[PDB]
Design a protein around this ligand. Sequence first.
Ligand SMILES: Cc1cc2nc3c(=O)[nH]c(=O)nc-3n(C[C@H](O)[C@H](O)[C@H](O)COP(=O)(O)OP(=O)(O)OC[C@H]3O[C@@H](n4cnc5c(N)ncnc54)[C@H](O)[C@@H]3O)c2cc1C
Ligand SMILES: Cc1cc2nc3c(=O)[nH]c(=O)nc-3n(C[C@H](O)[C@H](O)[C@H](O)COP(=O)(O)OP(=O)(O)OC[C@H]3O[C@@H](n4cnc5c(N)ncnc54)[C@H](O)[C@@H]3O)c2cc1C
Lengths: 471, 472
Amino acid sequence: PIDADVTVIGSGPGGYVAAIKAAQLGFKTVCIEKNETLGGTCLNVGCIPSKALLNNSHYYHMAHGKDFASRGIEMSEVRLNLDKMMEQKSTAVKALTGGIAHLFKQNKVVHVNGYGKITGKNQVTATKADGGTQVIDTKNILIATGSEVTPFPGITIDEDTIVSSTGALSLKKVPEKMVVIGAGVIGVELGSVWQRLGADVTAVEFLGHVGGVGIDMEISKNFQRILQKQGFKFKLNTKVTGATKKSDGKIDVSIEAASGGKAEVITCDVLLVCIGRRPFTKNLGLEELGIELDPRGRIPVNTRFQTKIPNIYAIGDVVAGPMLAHKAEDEGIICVEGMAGGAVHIDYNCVPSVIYTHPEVAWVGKSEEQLKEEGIEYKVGKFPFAANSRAKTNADTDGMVKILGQKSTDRVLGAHILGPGAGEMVNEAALALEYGASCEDIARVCHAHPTLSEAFREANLAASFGKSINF
Amino acid sequence: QPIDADVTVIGSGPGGYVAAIKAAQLGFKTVCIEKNETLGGTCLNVGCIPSKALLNNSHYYHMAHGKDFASRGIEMSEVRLNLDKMMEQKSTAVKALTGGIAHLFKQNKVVHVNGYGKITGKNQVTATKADGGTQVIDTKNILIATGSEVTPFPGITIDEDTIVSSTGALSLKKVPEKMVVIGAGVIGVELGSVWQRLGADVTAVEFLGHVGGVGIDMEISKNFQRILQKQGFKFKLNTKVTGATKKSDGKIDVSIEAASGGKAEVITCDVLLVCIGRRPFTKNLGLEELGIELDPRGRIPVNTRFQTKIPNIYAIGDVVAGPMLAHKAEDEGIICVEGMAGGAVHIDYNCVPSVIYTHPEVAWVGKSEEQLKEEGIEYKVGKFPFAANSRAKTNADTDGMVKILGQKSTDRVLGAHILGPGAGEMVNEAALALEYGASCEDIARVCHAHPTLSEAFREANLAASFGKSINF
Ligand SMILES: Cc1cc2nc3c(=O)[nH]c(=O)nc-3n(C[C@H](O)[C@H](O)[C@H](O)COP(=O)(O)OP(=O)(O)OC[C@H]3O[C@@H](n4cnc5c(N)ncnc54)[C@H](O)[C@@H]3O)c2cc1C
Ligand SMILES: Cc1cc2nc3c(=O)[nH]c(=O)nc-3n(C[C@H](O)[C@H](O)[C@H](O)COP(=O)(O)OP(=O)(O)OC[C@H]3O[C@@H](n4cnc5c(N)ncnc54)[C@H](O)[C@@H]3O)c2cc1C
């Protein structure tokens, strides 16, 4: 029987960071993880392996395609060694998951391997695989149990030929033809990986836009345009009625228009299902505690991330807000800081989103659609990467930066980046929004030349002064 | 016949052309004078743009020709360098961007005058064309943006064949087997790295004891040198060049000594690149008749409004004090012109970043540890290595670190130093933080997207403020 001040259930970005932070704050901290490794979804089957394949497949596309030839880099034959590519991804995951174990040891966090159940208001019971149980008597419980793939009814995932994101990250061979259910962030990234590697990729989406929820519509349409020129095909406003395996091993996917009619069937070697991810709370003990989930399966919490039970907290994918790794990390920190008497506030408006395709997509703050719905009057500033010096020097000119500013105060309300380096660039925008910078304020910052970030500067100038220098 | 203007800009580099565009946008009637055949000055034509083009392309060549692509499962039977085609890509970018300036001048109603400009009167500039024809401008204000030129090495004459300046090095016809670079500054290191990647055997000779030029943090410089040496870049620091001689075979013998004395030796090369610095260009501008005298280094003295001794004659960019960088020249051009219209004029050179576009990149803004010690400012240090950053590790691109210097009592960020991937873009987040007096804690509380290289910048600030980072 272990006693601790804070017991964290889950070792994903929210849990493992929260556990480290609590230990650094003087709490006696225990972290419970059922899986064989730490790091949760993001490290093991999420951010890390997908970004590795996006990076590796992009370079393959550059070598196999015309890009390197245009720069005087001539290759007689370019062939794909998928095993070695997957090996590079695996090397990264193992290095990072091992790093978490090193960090837990460094900060005196106690790692418990088992399935954690809340058996008492102050106790958690961890059941090991052999059946052995470890009991933790604890002042505070931090729930960071995360998410799972949302199943598609009538379509059964076998991680062989009908795959979730996990299976798509480890295909043993490039499928000749692949269908993706869901054109959200995960679907678009994974389809693009396999599309670059030679697969014929179609993504089927019930909604009318690509990129998931909260993405600016102009950005979404331009993003789709570029992806379509790459060879990514889209069926939007389209419903999937069912999928059936066949004797030949191919899969027939039956679809219909979302409004109705237009029945059709399409075939593939691999079907990837990414209609979403949902909060995971099974066999946690919430049933007995009287903690009621919201209709979407998330745990309700107050501003301090407290459940109705004051000493039981929840953070990350399991609660409301964007289901992102950096969001879960910050919630874990402020929640644990709140346990130490700190004030707790987060504005999900300042949580950025990134799509690691090429071109990348990144945004923070509000979209034009959000501003119109909230009745806020704004002005628009745009700068295309075709006019950016570094993008032109790199011969990589897709996309633009779009800035939304408050009409009178010039305050930056949203930043949307479609093009090279969007993922890193959005962090400059994030720093600006957190402290309420104006468009003029960013325009007056001396940005290094030549850098992609100058497109961000000039877009802010356009929103503020009405005109850019280089466009 | 003679032209009248509110603003006459001499020079079309980043300082001049941006200032001319801004002056027109403020309602001034603007004329821009350029002696060269194309607009854009040093940066576009023989500076930032072509060097960044070759750095980008030679870096990709290195990844394909070397082991990087193989480690990712991108297998190629043979990788060959088509130098002519690579130089073609560089030339195409320069052509598109210099032409783009012409469109912007046309878009903003700036009058483009092609000729050599001399200040013939307090309110008059005379442009002398190659044919000998002159066009005269009577103007209320004169903005000098005449830029810089290569600093020559006395006794070693550049012919842009085997003894080259940065200009010659950017257009070599073949990869030299052996190359010597005089000067380990930003330009020397970038160009030496390009040819080293393309197969040349490269040595850089530097009179000073560190690489990367002045203002670079010494710890960053030493780590940068260490990494470049593992790439194959060779350095001889604290080393003086006594002379260089061409040889009958066409090779070059470079005679060197330790700066303190002794260790005399000779090293031979196919190409010698002379990169000891750049200096202000004011030739035949008419300053002496106006009584405008240069400082010892050849720069035009100006006040905080960029005014010369003659209040209606201004100077900006490489010809004046401050870092000789393009974004510096652009900002000075905008605020100077804004000042002509009665606007406030202020720039903080401490908030001007510097970037080295090698791989890994080097970028910094604010103060170095050496500067803080010299100024007597007490600081605390926070560091985070890219080996611990998720995106860098995912990319298998893990060299370097982020170093943050914070004031001990106020927690104010005094300097940000980045050695590693994406440093050039990242420093712009740092510049935004310094310009508005952010603290280390302030940056640490910003939600940075995961996984990004910028998370290293957040964690380094957390380390400086709180004493510890999350992931290291
Ligand atoms: C393919 C893919 C790519 C992604 N890419 C990105 C990206 O680029 N950027 C981004 O921000 N997000 C990305 N995400 C999302 C990101 O992974 C999640 O938002 C994040 O992992 C959520 O963190 P969490 O700690 O809340 O949950 P999780 O990471 O799911 O952690 C939950 C952990 O708790 C454990 N656990 C659960 N219940 C129990 C229990 N009862 N007892 C014991 N242990 C338990 C689980 O085994 C798991 O290890 C991606 C997701 C996927 C699938
Ligand atoms: C190889 C190299 C790489 C560089 N890389 C970078 C980099 O990555 N980033 C960076 O910030 N900086 C870089 N620089 C420096 C950058 O080029 C300068 O800081 C910038 O060009 C300065 O702009 P300017 O307008 O002050 O001067 P210039 O660019 O030199 O412009 C001066 C112009 O005025 C013209 N002129 C001069 N005298 C007269 C006259 N009497 N009449 C008419 N016209 C005249 C010249 O012909 C020229 O076009 C690099 C420089 C070199 C050489």
